[PDB]
Design a protein around this ligand. Sequence first.
Ligand SMILES: CC[C@H]1OC(=O)/C=C/[C@H](C)[C@@H](O[C@@H]2O[C@H](C)C[C@H](N(C)C)[C@H]2O)[C@@H](C)C[C@@H](C)C(=O)/C=C/C=C/[C@]1(O)CO[C@@H]1O[C@H](C)[C@@H](O)[C@@H](OC)[C@H]1OC
Ligand code: HEM
Ligand SMILES: [Mg+2]
Length: 394
Amino acid sequence: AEPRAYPFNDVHGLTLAGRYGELQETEPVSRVRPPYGEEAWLVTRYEDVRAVLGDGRFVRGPSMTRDEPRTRPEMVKGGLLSMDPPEHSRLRRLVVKAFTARRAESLRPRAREIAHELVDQMAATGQPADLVAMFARQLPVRVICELLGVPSADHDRFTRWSGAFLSTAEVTAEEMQEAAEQAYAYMGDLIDRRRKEPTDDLVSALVQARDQQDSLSEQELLDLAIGLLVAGYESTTTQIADFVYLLMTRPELRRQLLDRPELIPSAVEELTRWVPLGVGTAFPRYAVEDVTLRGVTIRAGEPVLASTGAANRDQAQFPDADRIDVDRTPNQHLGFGHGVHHCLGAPLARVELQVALEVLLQRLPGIRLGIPETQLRWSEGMLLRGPLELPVVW
Ligand SMILES: CC[C@H]1OC(=O)/C=C/[C@H](C)[C@@H](O[C@@H]2O[C@H](C)C[C@H](N(C)C)[C@H]2O)[C@@H](C)C[C@@H](C)C(=O)/C=C/C=C/[C@]1(O)CO[C@@H]1O[C@H](C)[C@@H](O)[C@@H](OC)[C@H]1OC
Ligand code: HEM
Ligand SMILES: [Mg+2]
């Protein structure tokens, strides 16, 4: 009876559903029924979403058993986002000792070179070129190859395997399983090589990482490396396609960044706030005990969807929240999460998104859609929202 069908967002674009603003106003903790899995609470105000994501009483562990609210029939379980302190905390300390802000920044010149190569290839094939296939789907996985220390000769086949892990892939289950097996075997052998002769890449640094006198096991290293790959690939790819879609359809955004390229980092933050990247809200948290939130009792065990897409568009937190203002300040958005699970690749994701906009505007300052905006084909992957193809001219 009472729960609302969720997701509210239409996948065929980046429009924030008007339902979220309505619930922010008058029903900030509400019930939703997803296409698959359990009914759940949905939390939409910036304050409340931040509160749930930062509260020790809201955990992720039950994701390992539960029939989670979701938009696809299958469930992916495990990785860092399935874990709770203290087990989560230990892995996070070790991974961040290796995966530093310094290391992320140090990849900016290689990310620029790879971005320029991808534009070179677009220019070589000629116009219109598909920005999604040729650029957005290529830069983040090649940057992960560079991050981890995959030798250059293996980037193309590593990119091919990794393509099978995207929610937009049309491959068979057996095709995807073969790609997973090859990527895991490849990464294991890469870790064996770096254990034998360390160099200055992330795999070597993960081997060497110590926390107090603790370290990552051989199997933790391999599982965490694969986890970084999936966490850092589809999201960054989709966000690149979405940011350039916005650039190409909003003349003042493009003008402002052509005129003052120094605005690019601020524009990356503002677009990360504005773009409701998720179809709905994934990764439900579970109450460990009864919690009272905005007068509503969330019972021990119940799932709670804390919508960062809605939170980032809350009129109570961001003045004129639906406006894209590249100079917006402050901008304490939740686009890279909040609390203990907050995106650990965020420094790198920011480098990649900044480099993408920098290189495309420098090289292709007239970049624009090659077809009417109403003709764009949107992904029906049901996890993130973005164009399947972006035919561009310049
Ligand atoms: C929307 C992003 C999300 O995408 C996903 O969750 C992607 C899921 C795709 C759609 C899945 O693939 C489908 O599986 C079906 C059973 C068959 C489909 N085909 C073959 C007919 C197939 O397309 C999964 C099962 C693919 C495999 C390789 C996989 O486990 C991928 C995981 C990818 C995870 C993600 O890319 C990243 O999400 C990560 O999920 C982990 C479970 C978390 O721990 C966390 O990682 C650190 C988190 O990142 C922050
Ligand atoms: C634009 C690109 C990206 C976006 C929008 C993004 C967003 C996020 C968000 C919102 C979370 C928290 C999810 C939750 O708590 O429910 C998260 C977690 C994570 N991100 Fe990202 N991310 C991006 C890029 C990357 C990259 C490049 C990497 C790695 C190289 C990465 C690695 C991870 C990992 C490992 C987690 C799980 C952290 C944990 O559970 O402790 N991300 N990301
Ligand atoms: Mg050149």
